[PDB]
Ligand binder design. Structure first.
Ligand code: NA
Ligand code: NA
Ligand code: NA
Ligand code: NA
Ligand code: NA
Ligand code: NA
Ligand code: NA
Lengths: 172, 172
């Protein structure tokens, strides 16, 4: 109420339930990649210093042929994202804009990202992945959740509260 | 492990506790604006159609002489943001980049925002605000949480489960 951001998010409320976000990357490929590199990404989240590249995302862009030679193929990736919403026009504008927004966001921190790409293993068998893939993929999901079209949002007291929280609390 | 997102976010954990996100606008102003316009923004979030402008934000930008005539003053506002973290060097690059990203997002969504500024009251005392201020202030707080620097993140089990959620779940 008064301080609504105090309580925090609604409990049994999964944002993927509330907002049926289209699959920009094949879901089977993404879960495969998660099963393989999920534990490493979880560890790296707790490491200090330059953020380390997400190997889940880099796995996903390898498998879809969008990452190669330290380079993520912007035009090819953008087109894959549009193809994923070819049956969802309510998302087409949004997916287009998020794409450019996310690529431009990466460009602003490109120095940090490239630094991240150049790290050496901190330990035994550390896979050093280029952070570009995970920057784009996390950016997209966030851009999309945060701007979920009203026409697709799932309406219920907890999804409505999750929406109220995420829309108001970040600014106050 | 197996289903890292179905479970959803940690139960009683408030992002602001795990992440000491700096206040870019004076909290008094934000709270006064929220008390005036909270309820109306809550109803607007449930309305279909073009997204309606957030009056909480517009109120705050009025209070600080940042909004006038369908336009936020980009230079003055950016300056105000940077000034707000002058003693938080671990947020400077982040806030400045977020500032540019967020204005440039607004630019991409310009027709929608302008259309939202012209909407008609759907209920009796509904105030129609320009969406530009809400666009910027939500964008900023969302960019800032989503990239909370490792060096300032409060570490415990729940804040780590939260960060794992926030970084992995939006991409799968
Ligand atoms: Na780190
Ligand atoms: Na665009
Ligand atoms: Na941009
Ligand atoms: Na390393
Ligand atoms: Na404007
Ligand atoms: Na720019
Ligand atoms: Na009007």
């Amino acid at each position: 109420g008064d301080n609504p951001c105090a309580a925090g998010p609604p409990v049994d409320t999964n944002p993927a339930e509330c907002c049926p976000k289209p699959m920009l990357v094949d879901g089977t490929i993404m879960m495969d990649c998660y099963k393989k590199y999920g534990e490493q990404t979880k560890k790296q989240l707790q490491m200090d210093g330059i953020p380390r590249g997400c190997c889940i995302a880099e796995c996903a862009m390898n498998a879809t042929n969008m990452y190669a030679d330290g380079m993520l193929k912007r035009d090819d990736l953008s087109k894959m994202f549009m193809d994923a919403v070819k049956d969802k026009p309510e998302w087409m504008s949004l997916v287009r804009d998020a794409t450019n927004a996310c690529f431009e966001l990466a460009e602003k921190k490109m120095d940090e990202i490239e630094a991240g790409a150049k790290l050496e293993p901190s330990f035994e068998g550390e896979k050093i992945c280029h952070p570009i893939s995970g920057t784009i993929l996390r950016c997209m999901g966030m851009m999309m959740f945060a701007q979920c079209p009203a026409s697709v949002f799932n309406v219920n007291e907890n999804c409505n509260k999750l929406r109220e929280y995420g829309s108001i609390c970040p600014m106050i």
